């Protein structure tokens, strides 16, 4: 499935503050009105149907625009690296429901890594359970841990309440991450609207990463038996992936220093004039 990412994918090119100015820059951005691949989730049980739990590996290319909508925090994290063989260092960003953890280590990943949570009937609480991202870790260059907040453990489907936009690109060894969180009321596709992605982290990994893959989580309620047979729920969530390309953009800085709008001068003849 394909959707159109109308305006989205714009993040601040740099730290520099500007005001009431139009600053042109060339950086890797998602093109406007680009075509985005749509991935869908509802893990398939033994029975088959519309159900799909898509955890494919995707190309890193120029960098990846990642967007996800979540009813119930299905998507735990991502993997970045060439092989993911445990041959070399790779990036593992996962939220183990308790904290965000980042590890560079040479992890061994399973064929189909995923998370699962299980809920016991005796106690009414959703806790994580099955976790099979990595067998073992090799040497580790860097490790990071983050806040204690919790994530949505159950497979609850409904209008997508939240939107989390991320841009991953590694330039010069630096793995840059940008993000933005907003509430949304829309199941089908990305909302049409413009918003920036402020940079959260800059990691010095300096590893060459060819490809990446997303990680999802399972959600089990009390009713379910713990087993891996068919007691698990992937949830409603879906995510989108686009690819950045070197383009020129005109960024409009407001008085605040926040960017209200942008023009993709590559897009249309009207746009081309705007940059000039």
């Amino acid at each position, epitope marked *: *499935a394909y959707t159109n990412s109308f305006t989205r994918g714009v993040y601040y090119p740099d730290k520099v503050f500007r005001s009431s100015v139009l600053h042109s820059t060339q950086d890797l951005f998602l093109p406007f009105f680009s075509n985005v691949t749509w991935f869908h989730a509802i893990h398939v049980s033994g029975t088959n149907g*519309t159900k799909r739990f898509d955890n494919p590996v995707l190309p890193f290319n120029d960098g990846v625009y990642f967007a996800s909508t979540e009813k119930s925090n299905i998507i735990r994290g991502w993997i970045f690296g060439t092989t993911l063989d445990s041959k070399t260092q790779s990036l593992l960003i996962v939220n183990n429901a308790t904290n965000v953890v980042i590890k560079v280590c040479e992890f061994q990943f399973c064929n189909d890594p995923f998370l699962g949570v299980y809920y016991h009937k005796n106690n009414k609480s959703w806790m994580e359970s099955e976790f099979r991202v990595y067998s073992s870790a090799n040497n580790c260059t860097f490790e990071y841990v983050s806040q204690p907040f919790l994530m949505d453990l159950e497979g609850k489907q409904g209008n997508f309440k939240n939107l989390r936009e991320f841009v991953f690109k590694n330039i010069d060894g630096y793995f840059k991450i940008y993000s933005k969180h907003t509430p949304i009321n*829309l199941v089908r596709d990305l909302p049409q609207g413009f918003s920036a992605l402020e940079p959260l982290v800059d990691l010095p990994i300096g590893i060459n990463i060819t490809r990446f893959q997303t990680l999802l989580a399972l959600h089990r309620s009390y009713l379910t038996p713990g087993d891996s047979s068919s007691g698990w729920t992937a949830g409603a969530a879906a995510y989108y992936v686009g690819y950045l390309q070197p383009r020129t953009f005109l960024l409009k800085y407001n008085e605040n220093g926040t960017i209200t709008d942008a023009v993709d001068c590559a897009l249309d003849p009207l746009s081309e004039t705007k940059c000039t």
Partner: antibody
Amino acid sequence: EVQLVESGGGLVQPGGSLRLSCAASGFTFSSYWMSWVRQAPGKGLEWVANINQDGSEKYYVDSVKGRFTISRDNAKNSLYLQVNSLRAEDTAVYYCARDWDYDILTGSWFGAFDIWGQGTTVTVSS
Amino acid sequence: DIQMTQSPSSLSASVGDRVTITCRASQGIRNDLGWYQQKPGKAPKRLIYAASSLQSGVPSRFSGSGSGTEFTLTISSLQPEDFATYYCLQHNSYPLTFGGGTKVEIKR
């Protein structure tokens, strides 16, 4: 042949409870989303809830959230809309309705309601 | 969310005459729109889905067209049976929404 019948209904006081069943026949029940819809007397149509084929994903209108629970028994061929805690505004008729097409298909007609029951009336009053 | 606004809210026409009720989407629906016919107490019957498709058992007098955000349900030759309220609905995105409804009346 193809028939869907609502059930339950009846009056109960506010903060009351009702379990509207909906029996379906004439089609492969497990493959179609089902939908409750209400029409207060004098008012226009308002969609209540929907449930996906697998029975996992369920959606509700805001007014209803927490109050009503849409259940399903593909084996049973029944709809179950559990209602608590009833309000006056809740008075209306409830129709269970078929989606069109297969829930499986990418081209999804499921939102289109091709078949409807007669309805059931729920009256909430002292 | 999206709001569907039908117009006119009510109309009166003679038997054979052609009637056109329009529905306007606040947001671009694409063609995820359906039309339903409802009689006073009775439950609604689906007239059209996918904007153009007629559903089985409906007369050709009923037709539906649409492009962009605006859609139209036309009834080529009004019949007395046709008395009812007609509603448009958009299945495009959640929540599903119905228009206000247009009451049709037989001019006499």
